[PDB]
Ligand binder design. Sequence first.
Ligand SMILES: [Fe+3]
Ligand SMILES: [Zn+2]
Ligand SMILES: [Zn+2]
Ligand SMILES: [Zn+2]
Ligand SMILES: [Zn+2]
Lengths: 172, 172, 172, 172
Amino acid sequence: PSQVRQNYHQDAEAAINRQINLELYASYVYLSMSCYFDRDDVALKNFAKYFLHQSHEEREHAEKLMKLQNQRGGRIFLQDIKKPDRDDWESGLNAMECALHLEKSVNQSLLELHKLATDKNDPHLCDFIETYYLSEQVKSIKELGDHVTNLRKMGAPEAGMAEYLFDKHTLG
Amino acid sequence: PSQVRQNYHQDAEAAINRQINLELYASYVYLSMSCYFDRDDVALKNFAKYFLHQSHEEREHAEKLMKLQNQRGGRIFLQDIKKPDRDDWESGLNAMECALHLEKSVNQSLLELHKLATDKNDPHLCDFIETYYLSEQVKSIKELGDHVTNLRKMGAPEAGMAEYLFDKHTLG
Amino acid sequence: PSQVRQNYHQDAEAAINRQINLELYASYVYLSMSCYFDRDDVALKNFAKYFLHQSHEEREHAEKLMKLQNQRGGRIFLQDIKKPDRDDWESGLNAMECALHLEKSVNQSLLELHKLATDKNDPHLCDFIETYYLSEQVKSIKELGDHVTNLRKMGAPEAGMAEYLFDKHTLG
Amino acid sequence: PSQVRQNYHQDAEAAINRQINLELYASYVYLSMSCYFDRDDVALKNFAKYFLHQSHEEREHAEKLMKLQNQRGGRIFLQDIKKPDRDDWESGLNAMECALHLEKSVNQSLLELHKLATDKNDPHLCDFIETYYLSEQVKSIKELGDHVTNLRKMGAPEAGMAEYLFDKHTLG
Ligand SMILES: [Fe+3]
Ligand SMILES: [Zn+2]
Ligand SMILES: [Zn+2]
Ligand SMILES: [Zn+2]
Ligand SMILES: [Zn+2]
């Protein structure tokens, strides 16, 4: 064992490595969305900016878990980052719905990690998760739900002005 | 020959004179568009401003080619600047589509000039074109394509609010 | 075809997608190196900082190619980002040697892309590569070669003070 | 019972008093280390400064637990502060190893206190521990492990320049 390791179960170490991969995957999905909105036949610059910001945030989430793994004396093992499920995200509304689904799946993973940390009596890891991840995920999910609600009410994607005006007012 | 002339083929000199005329023509087309949008029965001030800016930029493009011709020891020969194809540009969307077509035709001319410079082994002229023209044309074409996409999606020109709101948000 | 596309061969579009994947892979390799140097049993903070910076730079390289693909009217197709070849990078000297090898492999890919752009008479793409990529790769390769030279001369990794003092002076 | 006391078990009160004594003991150990490095035959001023800072921090830890005890309506009962195990700490490396061992023993005590608070359903005390203590201990342990790693790699204590240069660069 590492000279720093204390109260850090092998199952937690493995679960953190899984979470690192999931956050890197989420970053890649957001990047894919961002570059869809930069296409000349889509051309919604503030949707593109919004998803690029989310991509960079997910990267920061992954890097903070890497720092945690080393702080606790675990060892980082990286895996392939799978490509996103689609190249064409269809519409601003569809991308926001897909983002909401993704954020909820990441939250579910974090709740399973917290349950594991609780079961292994690892309060530092429980607190880490609560302080830096759970907080943030609830806020993200609520923001995406609000965006989906507004776009649907405005008539997106069939009402042509809806995504245009949402891009200007809400995301601009 | 001019005392400064070196590695500057007569065919390149002639092609630069042609390009000067094309950039002056493009400036004149944009000016025509600008003054259509200032009509009391059209009244889209930010479309007018956008096309007047493009007119002034094309002028600057022409003047920079004139400077190049003299720097290399060629001689500028000016020709008539033909009037634009229309006086009435119909709509904001139609003017943006016509601008996209014009910008692509200017780009095609510049690509033919680069091919000539390459064939005559004139690296200074190739670099000039690449650095000051090709760069700029790709950016212009992408911007106009984005504008056309947005106006179509918003319902222009039949949806009456589309050009009005595009003028305010995108061009304002 | 995209409304913006002009003089952009399908082979170039495919090669740009390959290059995007390679730059994302390079970013991931650097990230792996960074987190090796943050291990409690390695503990070289300025090596970690150096490789994290390189990771972020490779990301920016990838994102700029994505912007180019959309500017030219190509379509981005993402692929899996493969995991790096090692988790344990052994030493500061070994990581710098591996980085040098990686940077040379990325340079080779870029030279093949330039040759393709030249063969398809695509001067905008040739200029893009030259201006934003080739420049940068030569500088990177020279810097890594200088680092490898200095670490070897100092006696790394067997001379225990060498990586410590290099971390302080050169990377600090 | 105190007029403020609510949900504060007698076992928790006793455990907090034990922890106060342990933090005061740790402060005293660090003070002993600090004054070893100020000896004329040791003369490592930045090691001395580092351990004096740690001594003052442990004092602050103890005082914050005293504040908690009174905030919850417990009563502070002080005990003798035992003298440290050694007067002569031998070397910079040995002192850092002894500090790492001490910090891990304090962490173990805090984890036992958290388990007690959890078992007595005292969420305010659990949160206190997590927020102000567990966080800090993990960071301390990782920093000391990094210092031990670097000193060993540099050749301390037998390589005479190692502690001297570590004192200058890392601790200065
Ligand atoms: Fe509005
Ligand atoms: Zn995340
Ligand atoms: Zn022009
Ligand atoms: Zn790169
Ligand atoms: Zn303490």
